[PDB]
Every structure is written in C-alpha cells, then in structure tokens.
Amino acid sequence: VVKQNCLKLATK
Amino acid sequence: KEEHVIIQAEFYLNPDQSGEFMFDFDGDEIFHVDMAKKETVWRLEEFGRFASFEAQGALANIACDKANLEIMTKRSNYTPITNVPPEVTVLTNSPVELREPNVLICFIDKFTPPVVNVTWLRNGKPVTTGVSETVFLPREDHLFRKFHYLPFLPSTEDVYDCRVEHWGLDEPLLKHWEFD
Amino acid sequence: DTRPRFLWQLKFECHFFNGTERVRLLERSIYNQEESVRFDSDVGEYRAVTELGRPDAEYWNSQKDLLEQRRAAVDTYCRHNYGVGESFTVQRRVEPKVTVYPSKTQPLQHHNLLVCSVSGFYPGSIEVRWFRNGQEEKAGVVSTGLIQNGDWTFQTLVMLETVPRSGEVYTCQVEHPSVTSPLTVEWRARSE
C-alpha cells in the first residue's frame, strides 16, 4: 500500500 | 452506485498534539500507524502477512498535518471546533448464550473532536482484560466513529456499562448492558 | 479541561465503479468540521470549498508538477492500492451465521417477535427475507438494518411480527455473496 503525500498550505 | 471506496485519513489536533494516520476500506480500518511506536498496526493480523506499508511516510504526513493546522488556526482567527457529543450503543457480537464466550461492543458514533475516555465497567468496577479498540474512523460529515471491545462470559449475575467521556457531554455517559 | 480545540483532517478518497474501470479520486482538507479545499480528479485542479481555502488552491494550482502527480494519481495511487489490497478487502467473503429464535416465550396465537439473527458476515451487501409456510412475508418486518462491528464483520437482526398458529413453519432466508445458494433456517410453531 502506498500513501499520497500531504501538501503544505500556502503561508499567506 | 460506487462499488468501493478506499480512504487515507489523517488528523492533527491542538493543543493535544494528537495525530492519526489510517487507511479505511468501505468503512473498516485496514491499518493505522501507531504514533508512539511509529509502526504500522494492521486491524486484522492476516493483512500484515500479505501487504506492507512504510510507517515512516505517515509520520512525515503527520508533521505536514500539524503545520497545516497551525496555518489554518491563525488564518481562521483562532476559531475553535464546536464539540459534537457522541451517540453510544452497546451490543454483543452474536446472540448471547449463557456461559459461552462472547464480545461486548461499545459503538461510539458521530462525534468530534476525536478525543474520548472510554472505560468498561463490570458490576461498577473497571475491567481491562482482553479489551481492545479501533482508532478513530472517518465519516463523510467529518465527524468520527470508534469501537471498543470487551470479551466476556455472559451470565445472569453480571451487569456491564460502557462509560464514555467527551467534551460535548455534560456528564459521563454510561451505556448499560445486562442479559435479558 | 476547557481549552479550545483546533482540528485538521486530510482525506484521500479513491471511489471505484465497475471494478477499476471508473475511478474518482477526492483529496480533501478539513478544518474543524469544514472542508476548505479539494482536488477532484473529475475536475482536474484544486478548488476552494470555503473562502479560507482560496490561497491554497491558487498556490497549488500554480505548480505543474503537483497537478501532474495528482492527475495521474487515479493510476499510481487508487488503482495501485486496489490491486495490492484486492485479495483481502474487495474479495473478502465470510459466510453469515444464521440463527432464529422467538424474542419471548409466548403461547401460540399470541403476538411475538421472531428474530432472525444474521451475524459475522462480510461484505455488507445481504438480503434477508421471511416466509410463512413458503410464502414471503413483506409486512411486519422490523429490521436493525446493517450493523458494522468494526472488525471486518457485520451483523443484522431481522425480526418478524407473528401471530403463530399450530403447525406453521417460518423460514428466514439469507442471500449473500459468500454462498452460491440461499441460507435457510426454519422455526416451527409447536403442534398443539
């Protein structure tokens, strides 16, 4: 089983 | 009319600093990653013999989840979550036969945030032997579901309660079971 | 304690139709109880759901590499996981245990609930029907519906309101993908 990577939100 | 859905569900919660990473298939947990032990825990052992998952990758996702929470917290001007108290139901795994092993299931549903204290009570006293539980399962309304289990030997002599505490409740909720 | 709580969730949902012929991926960020931004493979780019999600959609949509990964994910992620997981999830089949009993010990000709307990089965899709002397009883059926046990089994209690007469035979009939022919359990009203 493989995961999808969490994406970091925009910071503004 | 979908046949199946597979969900990778994660959460992070402040100020508790609690995180969760799990896979869900048609509503059942396939596995989650233990945050304490940093290892993949399969909901059923057989799964582990036939599949694999790199626990490390989940931890990295959790770090990202935490970062995203702090950004959204500030962005929303520190709008906190509204507590939604759980529905609680106690049932057995199969029809009761006196003096034949069985399992009490404490079914906790439709609540948020994902923090609960659950205690099994036998005749008013806490019991921990053989007990187990799932992690928090995701729901389409973004609330949570959770199961706790108590193997037991049914008898006319004992009573049981699942005692559930949640911030959305005014008092602890005791859900009762006895043979009838 | 009374300290305020702040909650973040992330969900990647792979929705499968007709085996894996049609696959839809839904990626969702949720703050507290509100979904803020999503990627829907049927749309092909990120969309803000609430106002707070606007900066994230704009930021992510500007990155070609992300969009390409996400757009191929119905293959590299959804179809892949379905494939490696298939044998023990999609194809999991566990036969129900079926037991029938009166809810209470009542005399003949008195109202009662005849319980058909169907337990320990997987998957959830199931048909439970009641018959009285070989005829289907459509009315007076009180069902719990499908109950998820949380351990990769389900159970259900399908109860029949009866006014049982001497000699009557009641049958609970179960159809489920685990068996090629219906399971049947009979309850016979005592001959008196």
Numbering used by the authors:
A (entry chain C): 308 to 319
B (entry chain A): 2 to 181
C (entry chain B): 2 to 193
Task: Show passages lifted from the paper.
Cell surface presentation of antigenic peptides by major histocompatibility class II (MHCII) molecules to CD4+ T cells plays a pivotal role in the adaptive immune response to foreign pathogens. Accordingly, MHCII:peptide complexes are extremely long-lived with half-lives of days to weeks, and empty MHCII molecules rapidly lose their ability to re-bind peptide. MHCII molecules anchor peptides through a conserved network of hydrogen bonds and a series of pockets within the peptide-binding groove. Further studies demonstrated that DM not only acts on MHCII:CLIP complexes but can promote the exchange of any peptide.
DR1 carrying a DRα V65C mutation was loaded with a truncated version of HA that was missing residues P-2, P-1 and P1. As removal of the P1 anchor residue greatly reduces peptide affinity for MHCII, the HA peptide also carried a cysteine substitution at P6 which allowed covalent linkage of the peptide into the peptide-binding cleft via DRα V65C. The 2.12 Å dataset revealed two molecules in the asymmetric unit and the structure refined to Rwork and Rfree values of 19.9 and 23.7% respectively. Unexpectedly, when the electron density corresponding to the peptide was examined, significant density in the area of the P1 pocket was observed. The difference in mass between the two peaks corresponded precisely to one valine residue and a peptide containing an extra valine at the N-terminus fitted the calculated density well. Due to the peptide truncation, these hydrogen bonds are absent in the structure presented here (DR1:pHA*P1-P11 [P1V]) and DR1β H81 instead forms a hydrogen bond to a water molecule that bridges DR1β H81 and the peptide N-terminus. MHCII residues flanking and forming the P1 pocket exhibit no change in position. , the flexible C-terminus of the DRα chain in one molecule binds to the partially empty peptide-binding groove of an adjacent DR1 molecule. When we measured direct DM binding of the species that crystallized, DR1:pHA*P1-P11 [P1V], we found a 5-fold reduction in binding compared to our index complex DR1:pHA*P2-P11. The most likely explanation for this binding is that only a small portion of DR1:pHA*P1-P11 [P1V] is in a DM-responsive conformation and this conformation is not represented in the crystal structure.
